[PDB]
């Protein structure tokens with residue numbers, strides 16, 4: 001079987017982007033699987049293919065190989081390899097083992113929560129290879145969970161479920177993130193792992209960790225701040241926080257359930273002023289249409305946090321959405337510091353950690369933005 | 377005396393940008409100096425003012441102070457302070473003491489080359505304060521040179537010259553940059569200091585440091601690469617390189633005078649292939665008009681270096697021009713890796729070191745872009 005694509009799709013794969021959408025496909029196999037892609041009789045790549053989706057082709061190799069399935073399971077080896085050296089030098093931390101496209105393993109995500117792996121396939125061809133994927137994980141895991149309930153799997157013609165693929169997987173587990181530890185529900189945002197560690201270098205009296213979830217940022221901040229106030233919407237989240245709090249021996253970490261948009265503008269009126277504020281909200285946009293409205297949401301919250309800071313305070317602001325490009329994200333923060341009539345010096349601009357790889361030729365692998373500013 | 381500005385200029389200073397151009401000024405003192413700025417009878421800031429230039433106002437304080445000259449010399453203290461802690465923990469390295477606008481000291485630049493300071497005033501009001509500036513520098517320098525030959529000083533109505541402002545300043549001096557040392561002509565690009573140190577983590581056979589000047593990158597690379605080949609135009613530059621080379625005890629550092637644009641496309645034909653390439657060209661654009669042509673220049677050289685790399689090699693590419701914004705710079709590198717049909721993974725994205733501060737509300741303080749990619 002061969003996948004044929006037009007001149008547009010051919011150029012995309014030659015520029016090294018991995019996706020070819022349906023409208024640029026001419027002919028393709030009858031069923032989902034691993035097939036080679038051509039532009040006439042010129043080989044372009046090997047790929048994960050689905051004939052029933054707008055995103056039809058997902059390249060994982062740009063050179064012909066004897067066995068397409070071997071080549072794939074090969075990328076998985078080299079992807080697990082790039083980690084290991086770190087997996088044995090900190091077997092208790094939380095790291096990503098496979099970051100889909102970024103590791104040339106499209107539609108596959110596999111996270112490591114200190115021994116207990118969690119696989120996540122979202123491309124049809126993977127579903128049947130879950131047993132091989134698990135085989136490569138045993139030399140490092142104590143178990144493997146298949147969390148395939150993603151609503152995204154429905155577009156692929158895949159069933160929604162969740163269940164073990166090796167050993168026995170607990171209900172939860174603790175992760176050693178630097179000088180602190182946290183729990184995961186076999187919940188954890190490994191993307192901000194190294195940015196949370198960055199925050200340990202700051203000292204001060206009051207710190208306000210907004211959109212904190214389980215208080216990942218608060219635990220690190222509690223080590224250098226008199227008081228820390230983790231804020232969130234889901235009461236279930238703040239709870240995991242208090243739990244992570246005591247588990248570390250931290251008393252200076254009071255939580256506070258509420259809607260950040262009301263809590264902030266309010267704290268500004270009551271005269272509340274902090275030494276460091278961390279903002280780490282969620283997408284605010286599911287589609288290219290939310291970009292406009294999302295921009296305002298992000299702006300408000302940042303404008304507000306800036307006003308809550310004392311002269312000299314630190315602002316750590318972030319975004320994880322693929323709809324909030326980096327130039328936009330930074331434009332917004334400047335729009336916020338502008339309206340606030342406050343001058344922010346740039347402390348540092350960070351992105352995604354090494355275990356969440358980014359491919360230049362494939363923009364969609366780049367979503368995390370993390371910046372640290374000092375108000376003057 | 378008071379400086380009056382229209383509604384546009386008033387908004388610029390309220391958004392915390394420091395410049396107000398001539399067309400947004402209503403009334404101002406008869407001669408250059410330090411005056412307060414108002415929008416009607418509403419105080420906006422203190423500033424360095426020149427009535428004969430398009431760039432009329434340069435804010436250095438956004439609050440009224442008893443003594444405008446004291447406030448200025450105060451910013452200078454807090455600017456020298458932010459360094460010192462580092463100046464005593466590495467008294468032999470090269471650091472920037474004053475980065476103009478970024479330190480709220482407009483039109484003033486003062487570099488430290490291991491004890492020997494070099495001041496550079498480009499705003500008229502500073503010229504008469506050079507003696508006070510030098511006073512704040514003695515507690516740290518062995519001398520102070522006034523390199524005021526910048527062609528830019530002519531717009532300000534200032535004379536072009538160069539001469540000592542304290543002690544005796546040598547003809548040259550060595551700087552301790554990490555695990556290597558280099559010479560300066562009382563020549564040195566302190567902006568790339570911390571990016572050169574970053575490069576020490578790489579190992580490999582052949583490394584090609586293009587646009588190297590005195591071989592700052594080559595000296596660091598020689599520590600982990602079999603051979604290193606510093607390239608440049610000015611033969612006088614490569615010479616300082618060989619000198620810096622032997623001074624470190626490095627034999628694996630051959631230089632090569634030539635025009636990078638010819639040398640690269642050529643090396644591609646001769647089949648030359650490297651393990652790491654560093655590109656650190658100059659502006660390529662003096663004005664907003666060169667942006668178009670500059671873009672192509674930057675693109676070519678990057679496209680070429682990418683083709684010279686082996687599968688797995690590292691590319692460290694940079695830009696120091698204020699006309700090549702960051703999104704443009706990264707677009708160009710993607711355009712290059714695209715045309716090259718090579719897939720580049722992002723190793724790291726860095727900017728300017730702490731001693732070359734950037735102000736969010738004032739874009740012109742941000743010019744350095746430094747990125748590291750791994751070809752796959």
Ligand SMILES: Nc1ncnc2c1ncn2[C@@H]1O[C@H](CSCC[C@H](N)C(=O)O)[C@@H](O)[C@H]1O
Nearest residue numbers: 189192211212213216232233234259260280
């Ligand atoms: N409108 C809203 N107001 C306040 N918090 C919200 C919100 N909408 C979502 N959130 C919370 O924002 C959080 C984003 S995830 C936070 C990640 C956390 N800092 C870590 O590093 O682990 C979620 O926990 C979510 O419950």
Ligand SMILES: Nc1ncnc2c1ncn2[C@@H]1O[C@H](CSCC[C@H](N)C(=O)O)[C@@H](O)[C@H]1O
Nearest residue numbers: 565568587588589592608609610635636656
């Ligand atoms: N057309 C050209 N071809 C090759 N090199 C050039 C060039 N134009 C300018 N250069 C060289 O590019 C260099 C830019 S400065 C290099 C900085 C150096 N890497 C350091 O870290 O100290 C200068 O030394 C300049 O002489």
